[PDB]
């Protein structure tokens, strides 16, 4: 749930312990080497993101240890180490543990970790793969998995029929034969009936899957336009669909007209407009499948002021929802912030 604290020793730029105490809701980070705090959590969490200190006005280091205070519904410590050679350990409340063990209360998605590159990760990607982001928010991916295996399972039961059709023709001609053939084709006829109606089921389920998809896709459209204005003030914003049908494998375009320039294509928009639109997009996807962890890594650096304001505004208002830790050099957020920790390059931090 709401993160209590982060303990930091020997990690990247971090010489001494610098412990960070992490309020519920909004929190802040200032610098021109500060960037590395997201990476900490990012890394302790296990998502993708030298890795140990070595700073030359100080002796190089062979371990890195980072700790997540992080209270759940108890206070639960999640802590991660690495060495040369080196081993790596995992400790819940400082007792050593496995990694599958990390998820647990995580799945019984989770957090979002947002940097400037991820915001390009999206905008750039060929509009085919993008729908994955909506499939994910439409919660429709699990169906897609099991459906997929039920099919691979279905071809099995299929091939056995063909193998059965083979004896049936060989059986065209004592007491053995007639009693069997009468039954064999009796039973196989029953079997292809089962098979048929399963695909039937996949249809309906594919109807719900898509019903599921765009029911959600429509909601994400509403908020995309509504949030776009709350930031640009305003313009229109829509998310198109290449191949409106063939939905399951169809694509999603993102078109935005910031105030001034007419409704047109992203990028050739340029600016920190093409930035803002995505921040707008993200607040809105966050509306359909929210998560109680959000970090933002120097994301508003292309926005101009009142922009930076309205964005920072949005987080000011996004408080009681999820815990927000944003890291930036920006002024709009800094005073609109709640709690700041300064980080200055070896690096050091406190209020």
């Amino acid at each position: 749930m709401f993160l209590k604290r982060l303990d930091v020793i020997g990690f990247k730029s971090f010489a001494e312990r610098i412990s960070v105490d992490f309020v519920k809701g909004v929190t802040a980070v200032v610098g021109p080497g500060k960037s590395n705090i997201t990476d900490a959590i990012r890394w302790v969490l296990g998502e993708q993101s030298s890795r140990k200190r070595l700073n030359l006005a100080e002796v190089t280091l062979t371990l890195d240890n980072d700790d997540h205070f992080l209270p759940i519904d108890h206070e639960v410590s999640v802590t991660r180490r690495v060495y040369r050679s080196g081993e790596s350990e995992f400790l819940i409340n400082n007792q050593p543990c496995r990694l599958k063990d990390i998820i647990d209360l995580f799945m019984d998605e989770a957090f979002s970790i947002i940097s400037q590159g991820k915001v390009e990760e999206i905008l750039s990607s060929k509009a085919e793969d993008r729908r994955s982001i909506f499939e994910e928010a439409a919660g429709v991916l699990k169906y897609k998995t099991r459906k997929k295996k039920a099919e691979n399972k279905l071809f099995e039961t299929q091939d056995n029929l063909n193998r059965v059709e083979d004896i049936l023709h060989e059986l065209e001609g004592f007491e053995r034969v007639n009693e069997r053939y009468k039954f064999l084709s009796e039973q196989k006829e029953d079997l292809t009936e089962a098979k048929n109606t399963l695909f039937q089921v996949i249809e309906e389920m594919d109807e719900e899957m898509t019903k599921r998809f765009n029911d959600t896709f429509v909601q994400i459209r509403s908020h995309f336009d509504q949030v776009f204005r709350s930031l640009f003030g305003g313009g229109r914003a829509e998310l198109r669909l290449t191949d409106p049908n063939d939905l399951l494998h169809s694509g999603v375009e993102i078109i935005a007209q910031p105030p001034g320039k007419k409704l047109q294509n992203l990028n050739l928009l340029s600016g920190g407009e093409r930035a803002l639109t995505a921040i707008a997009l993200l607040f809105s996807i966050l509306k359909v499948r929210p998560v109680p962890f959000c970090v933002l890594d120097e994301v508003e650096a292309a926005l101009d002021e009142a922009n930076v304001f309205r964005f920072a505004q949005y987080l000011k208002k996004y408080s009681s929802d999820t815990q927000f830790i944003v890291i930036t050099h920006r002024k709009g957020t800094m005073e609109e912030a709640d709690v700041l920790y300064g980080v200055t390059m070896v690096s050091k931090v406190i209020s």
Binding site: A138, G139, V140, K142, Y143, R146, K147, K149, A150, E151, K153, L154, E156, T157, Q158, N160, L161, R163, V164, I167, L184, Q187, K188, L191, A194, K195, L198, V201, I202, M205, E208, M209, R212, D215, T216, Q219, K287, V288
Partner: protein, 67 residues
């Protein structure tokens, strides 16, 4: 006290939804929509679980036929 654990929490869950959202009018709200999604996606997923198991027994029964 009888019937099931399940249907009884269905009598229930149903009775709650109405008492929160479907109260006079039935006002669609951001967290009402959320509520239906979370619920309406589940049923698909549960269905998809019985879907895998269904196809399974078929391959199995398909298989007992032949040696």
């Amino acid at each position: 006290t009888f019937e099931g654990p399940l249907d009884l929490l269905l009598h229930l869950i149903n009775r709650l939804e109405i008492d929160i959202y479907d109260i006079p009018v039935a006002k669609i709200t951001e967290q009402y929509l959320l509520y239906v999604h979370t619920m309406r996606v589940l049923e698909l997923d549960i269905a998809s679980e019985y879907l895998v198991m269904a196809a399974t027994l078929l391959s199995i029964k398909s298989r007992m036929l032949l040696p």
